[PDB]
Nucleic acid binder design. Structure first.
Ligand code: MG
Ligand code: MG
Ligand code: ZN
Ligand code: ZN
Ligand code: ZN
Ligand code: ZN
Lengths: 162, 162
DNA sequence: TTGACTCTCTTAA
DNA sequence: GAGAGTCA
DNA sequence: TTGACTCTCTTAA
DNA sequence: GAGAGTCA
């Protein structure tokens, strides 16, 4: 809600609830042929999810609290960042999973960045493979690799140069 | 159905027409602090665009030919790949700009790959900066770099571990 | 047969 | 990656 | 007040 | 990154 105190209270209530979610160990590629371990705090697959939480999409949740007798609601992963600017360079800030695990609500696995920065982590070589993200990746992106391109650049005649 | 010969004729007429688009020289990052040159064949900003071409969106065009009284229409960048498989690993193939310039229709700047592979090129370090794409990038992706993350992983209490 | 517009759709963050 | 409404 | 559902939206390839 | 309709 409006006051800093009320916002800190929301963050603290959220952390306490999420902190009771099951802690799931995930072994992940780091890049450079190395492997690490992340501890995700995973929201349950079905109701009940936890105090204040409700599912609005297959992998979308929202946190809600009643403050000043009014319901205040936020995307489940946005709560840690309620005191941060909500935009950067005119682009909306998004919650962004460093563990690439939607159900995870561990704030140590979240950052707050443009959707472009968010998406780009999917292809990052990872913290031991050359990640250059200023807020460093926790793992190699799940889509990192050579790809599966079906056909490369080509011409039939002689009209084009690279 | 169109025969192979008819498809080749469509590809040839498309190449003939695109080869008369203005050829624009662009200096581009290759990765590793190196600069290179790409020559894009750019569709005009407004009509007329060229024989067979029409704009269906701000940065979307289609190529249309009438063959034996039947109107055939394709996405304007898909024509080079009409003799290729249209899916791979259960995913639809997309035209993918290696020059990241939608107006460009240079087939030497296009490949044919999943939308995920396509998007991921936006963040690639480039052919001189560590590109691992099997069909190599022509340039560093426009979104490569440290990013502009507003807030990193953080907790107010001690409920979490990474 | 052709040009120049119009509309909505897909994907996965 | 989001916001908001309908019920009980 | 709290929970458990429903719906559509945003972005940029 | 796509497909398809209207009109002259
Ligand atoms: Mg993400
Ligand atoms: Mg692309
Ligand atoms: Zn996690
Ligand atoms: Zn990274
Ligand atoms: Zn080009
Ligand atoms: Zn590449």
């Amino acid at each position: 809600a409006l006051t800093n105190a009320q916002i800190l209270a929301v963050i603290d209530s959220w952390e306490e609830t999420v902190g009771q979610f099951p802690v799931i160990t995930h072994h992940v590629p780091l890049g450079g042929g190395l492997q690490g371990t992340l501890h995700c705090y995973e929201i349950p697959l079905a109701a009940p999810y936890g105090v204040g939480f409700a599912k609005n999409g297959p992998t979308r949740w929202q946190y809600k609290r009643t403050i000043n007798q009014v319901v205040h609601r936020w995307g489940s992963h946005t709560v840690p960042f309620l005191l941060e600017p909500d935009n950067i360079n005119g682009k909306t800030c998004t919650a962004s999973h460093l563990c690439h695990n939607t159900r995870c609500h561990n704030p140590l696995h979240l950052c707050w960045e443009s959707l472009d920065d968010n998406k780009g982590r999917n292809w990052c070589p990872g913290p031991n493979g050359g990640c250059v993200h200023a807020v460093v990746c926790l793992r190699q992106g799940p889509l990192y690799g050579p790809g599966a391109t079906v056909a490369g650049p080509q011409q039939r005649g002689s009209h084009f140069v690279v």
